[PDB]
Amino acid sequence: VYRRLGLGPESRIHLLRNLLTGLVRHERIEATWARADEMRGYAEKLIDYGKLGDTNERAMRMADFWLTEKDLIPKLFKVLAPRFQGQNGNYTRMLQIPNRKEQDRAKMAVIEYKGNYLPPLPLPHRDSNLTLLNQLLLGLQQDL
């Protein structure tokens, strides 16, 4: 249930720790698809710790350990946590990007923090209902 990355399990935590810290600072990070999926679960769980409250000692310990840069700790409790108070989940959005042209052709994906101020990503749009097929289905819906 866990990918093998880095030179060891501790390196994976440190690698995951670095990735989590980078995401918070920028809110949008591009990395290999396998690594991005691995870090997605941790990011969502951290927001739950932020929602728990700043005064929570466990959250403070967790926030301090995971976020190397301490200026982010106020941001989590005063920017990230307040923003997603309404939402119950799905805080992180991960999308596929064309593979890197670095001679290794690794699978590339982009993971972003939802609600950010960054420019909107070019997300896919479903087919419009004005299409012939959709219109026919709409007629069936109306009859029913």
Partner 1 sequence: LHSKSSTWWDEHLSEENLSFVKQLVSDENKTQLTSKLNPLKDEPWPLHPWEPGSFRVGLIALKLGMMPLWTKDGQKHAVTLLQVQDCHVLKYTPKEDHNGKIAALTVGGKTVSRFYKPDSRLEFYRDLGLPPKQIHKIFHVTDNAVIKPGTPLYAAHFRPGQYVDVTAKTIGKGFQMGNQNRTVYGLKVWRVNTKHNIIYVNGSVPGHKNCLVKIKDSTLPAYKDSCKNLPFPTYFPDGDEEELPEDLFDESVWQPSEPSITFA
Partner 2 sequence: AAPKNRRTIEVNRCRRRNPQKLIKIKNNIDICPECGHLKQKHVLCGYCYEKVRQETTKIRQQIGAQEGGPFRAPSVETMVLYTGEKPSEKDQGKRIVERNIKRPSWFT
Partner 3 sequence: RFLSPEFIPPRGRTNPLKFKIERKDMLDRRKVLPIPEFYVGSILRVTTADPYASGKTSQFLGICIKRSGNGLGATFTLRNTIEGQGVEICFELYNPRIQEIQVVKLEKRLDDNLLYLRDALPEYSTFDVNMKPVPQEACQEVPVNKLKVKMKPKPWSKRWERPNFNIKGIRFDLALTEEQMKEAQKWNKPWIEFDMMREYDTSKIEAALWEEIEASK
Strand partners, 111: 29, 94
Find out whether 66 and 20 touch, Cβ atoms under 8 Å. yes
Q: Which residue has the tokens 């997605």?
A: 40
* Closer residue to partner 1 (CB): 7 or 144: 144
CA 99 to chain centre: 19
Lay out the site mask for partner 1 across 102-141 (x = CB under 8 A, - = otherwise): ------------------------xxxx-x-xx--xx-xx
Q: Does 60 participate in binding partner 3 (rule CB under 8 A)?
A: no
- Interface with partner 2 in residues 12-71 (CB under 8 A): 25-26, 28, 69-71
CA 64 to CA 67: how far, in whole Å?
A: 5
CA 128 to CA 125: how far, in whole Å?
A: 8
Which residues are near partner 3 by CB under 8 A?
A: 1-2, 9-10, 13, 41-42, 45-46, 61-62, 65-66
Which residues are near partner 1 by CB under 8 A?
A: 126-129, 131, 133-134, 137-138, 140-141
